[PDB]
Structure formats: structure tokens, C-alpha cells
Structure 1
Amino acid sequence: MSIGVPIKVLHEAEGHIVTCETNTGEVYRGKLIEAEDNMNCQMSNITVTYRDGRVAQLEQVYIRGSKIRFLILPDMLKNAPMLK
């Protein structure tokens, strides 16, 4: 009644390797440490593909969830209990 299913799947994706695209086209693949009700994602050990194609290694990242276009989660969470 209060919290939705996709934020439960986002909380279920913590510890896993998620790849989050942001509003400025930058793709961040790495270990999602923590995520909140708003989609503020503290992630770590991040491989970053910018818009040009350059890849950087940013070891501790906190993305503001407003700017997140989407996150690609592991398909393990296709069997997560809140997706039933």
C-alpha cells in the first residue's frame, strides 16, 4: 500500500552487479551497495561507459536516483519473491 514492487526489486539488487544508465547517457556497471526508496544508488567497483565510448574505473559511486533512466538488474531477481 506504501512501497512499490520495483523498489523492492531494487533493494533486492543490492550486493549484485547492476548496470545503471543515467540521464546524461553514462552507463555505470558495478556492485550496487545500497539503494533507497528514491533510486539513489550507492554502487562500487564501477565500469563506466560514457557517451563517447570511453570506459573509466570509478571505485565508489553514488548516483542520484532522479537522473537514473533505468537500471539493468541481474536475471536472478526474475525469481525474487516480490516478482511472484
Structure 2
Amino acid sequence: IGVPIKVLHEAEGHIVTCETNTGEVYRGKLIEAEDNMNCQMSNITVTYRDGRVAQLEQVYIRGSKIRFLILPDMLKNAPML
């Protein structure tokens, strides 16, 4: 497990954002993140490429279609970093 993979695993359980490959951005509580950056979120707020916003009860984003992830700043206080 790499150090960004460790940071993504430690970022689960809190509210994080993730930009999709299609242009959408979903921000919500990250339930579980895997080694392949597949992230599950519960009660997330998604924003499409046009700018419209929506709410989702449960969503799952593959790591192959994930562009970037925005974590809280406390993950910068990790003992590895």
C-alpha cells in the first residue's frame, strides 16, 4: 500500500470531494476506499459539468474514472508525512 493509498484509506469516514472523469464533482462522507482508489460515498452532493447540483443516497466511483480527490487538512498531519 502506497502513501497516497494510505492517505486515501485514512481519509475514509470523513467528508471528502472527488472529481470525476466526465467532469462531475461529488463531495460526501467517504464510506470505504480500496487499494485501486474505488471510493464509496453516502449522502453525497454531486455537481455535473453544466453546473447543476443533486443529492445521492449512496454512490460508488471507480478509481479508473477518478481524476482528483480533495481530502481534509488533518490528513496532512499523518505520521508518514
| TM-score, length-scaled by structure 2 | 0.96
Aligned equivalents of 2:57 and 2:80: distance in 1?
30
Range 74-83 or range 50-59, more displaced: 74-83
The CA deviation at 1:82 is 2.3
> How far does the alpha carbon of each residue in 1:27-60 deviate from its partner, in whole angstroms, 9 at most, with x for none?
0000000000001001111000100110000010
CA RMSD between the two structures: 0.7
| TM-score, length-scaled by structure 1 | 0.93
The CA deviation at 1:73 is 0.4
Identity %: 100
Q: Is the 8 A contact 1:8 1:82 kept in 2?
A: no
Aligned to 2:48: 50
Q: Is the 8 A contact 1:9 1:82 kept in 2?
A: no
Regions of 4+ moved over 6 Å: none
Unaligned runs of 5+ in 1: none
Aligned equivalents of 1:24 and 1:49: distance in 2?
11
- Give the number of aligned pairs: 81
Aligned to 2:78: 80
